[PDB]
Design an enzyme around this catalytic site. Sequence first.
Site, PDB file in Angstrom:
ATOM      1  N   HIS A   1      34.958  26.076  57.603  1.00  0.00           N
ATOM      2  CA  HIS A   1      36.262  27.184  57.831  1.00  0.00           C
ATOM      3  C   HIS A   1      37.433  26.162  58.796  1.00  0.00           C
ATOM      4  CE1 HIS A   1      33.615  27.384  61.007  1.00  0.00           C
ATOM      5  NE2 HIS A   1      34.531  27.242  62.344  1.00  0.00           N
ATOM      6  N   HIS A  27      39.749  20.951  66.711  1.00  0.00           N
ATOM      7  CA  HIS A  27      40.044  20.605  64.956  1.00  0.00           C
ATOM      8  C   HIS A  27      40.930  21.413  64.870  1.00  0.00           C
ATOM      9  CE1 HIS A  27      38.595  24.591  67.267  1.00  0.00           C
ATOM     10  NE2 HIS A  27      39.596  25.230  66.421  1.00  0.00           N
ATOM     11  N   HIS A  75      43.808  24.020  62.145  1.00  0.00           N
ATOM     12  CA  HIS A  75      44.082  25.187  61.122  1.00  0.00           C
ATOM     13  C   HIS A  75      45.150  24.978  60.309  1.00  0.00           C
ATOM     14  CE1 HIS A  75      40.924  27.854  63.309  1.00  0.00           C
ATOM     15  NE2 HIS A  75      42.131  26.684  64.389  1.00  0.00           N
ATOM     16  N   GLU A  90      48.281  28.873  63.594  1.00  0.00           N
ATOM     17  CA  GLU A  90      48.147  30.646  63.783  1.00  0.00           C
ATOM     18  C   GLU A  90      49.249  30.660  64.749  1.00  0.00           C
ATOM     19  OE1 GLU A  90      43.365  29.693  65.306  1.00  0.00           O
ATOM     20  OE2 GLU A  90      43.447  30.845  63.332  1.00  0.00           O
ATOM     21  N   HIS A 120      43.426  22.440  68.203  1.00  0.00           N
ATOM     22  CA  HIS A 120      43.313  23.266  69.311  1.00  0.00           C
ATOM     23  C   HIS A 120      42.241  21.990  69.544  1.00  0.00           C
ATOM     24  CE1 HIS A 120      43.864  27.298  66.917  1.00  0.00           C
ATOM     25  NE2 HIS A 120      44.784  26.927  67.749  1.00  0.00           N
ATOM     26  N   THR A 167      40.399  32.599  67.652  1.00  0.00           N
ATOM     27  CA  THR A 167      40.850  32.493  66.528  1.00  0.00           C
ATOM     28  C   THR A 167      39.792  32.745  64.947  1.00  0.00           C
ATOM     29  OG1 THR A 167      41.621  30.850  65.213  1.00  0.00           O
ATOM     30  CG2 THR A 167      43.020  31.617  67.469  1.00  0.00           C
TER      31      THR A 167
END
Length: 257
Positions: free
Chosen positions: A61, A91, A93, A103, A116, A195
């Site tokens: 992910h 990591h 997103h 996010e 994050h 999240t």
Amino acid sequence: HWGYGKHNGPEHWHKDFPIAKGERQSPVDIDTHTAKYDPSLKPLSVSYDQATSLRILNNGHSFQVTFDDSQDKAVLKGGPLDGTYRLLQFHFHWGSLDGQGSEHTVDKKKYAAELHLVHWNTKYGDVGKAVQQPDGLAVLGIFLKVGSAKPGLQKVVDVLDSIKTEGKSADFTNFDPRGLLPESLDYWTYPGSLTTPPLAECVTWIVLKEPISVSSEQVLKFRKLNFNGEGEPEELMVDNWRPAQPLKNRQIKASFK
Ligand SMILES: COC(=O)[C@@H]1C[C@@H](OS(N)(=O)=O)CN1S(=O)(=O)[C@@H]1O[C@@H](CO)[C@@H](O)[C@@H](O)[C@H]1O
Ligand SMILES: [Zn+2]
């Protein structure tokens, strides 16, 4: 199971994880004009000088860089936090296009990506226990915009082709996360959640006002990663972000005027 696709994405998550519709879910839209300046907030203390990175990993992910969290090396404290929080991993997103990927949003604005840095409260001993506590985790969120390159990110982006598919990992030592931080530590903070599943409501969110700039070539390399494992139909790891969730009965505080 869960993912970011049409049939297993964020709108489906509540079925396996009912807390998805809970009272303190993340991310949220940060309404800058409604956020309240709180002069009682201490400055953020980011102490990363002794950080020990271990591995970089494609986890299906996102990709994450993991740290040795077996002593108080890289720690976060101060700001809204009580106590000491150990850096465990960071990591990202990101989106399929530069206008989406973050996010959190700022006055509904989406950034190209969001970083994050995940920390857990040392008073709970291990991260598994911390995720069961309302103040178990502190996540430092940093927005990425596309423009100039971030030199500190380049060592990360250059090994991504070695962890293309889910399950792959590589030795990733001596990476300095200080190279990913913007100038200012001005932040917004609010009580929230992971999240991704299990979406546990264990996170004090600390989101920096100042984005870092990364180059198009850098984020393009993010987008070459795969959700799938090797031998499965190639689905590009893009748009691995959860959209903004209802603020409900929460106040976002700002550390700055
Ligand atoms: C990619 O990161 C993770 O897998 C999860 C989600 C991510 O949440 S978010 N996006 O709000 O920062 C954080 N972690 S996590 O929940 O701290 C995840 O938690 C524990 C499991 O209970 C640990 O095994 C950690 O390895 C940690 O990565
Ligand atoms: Zn995250």
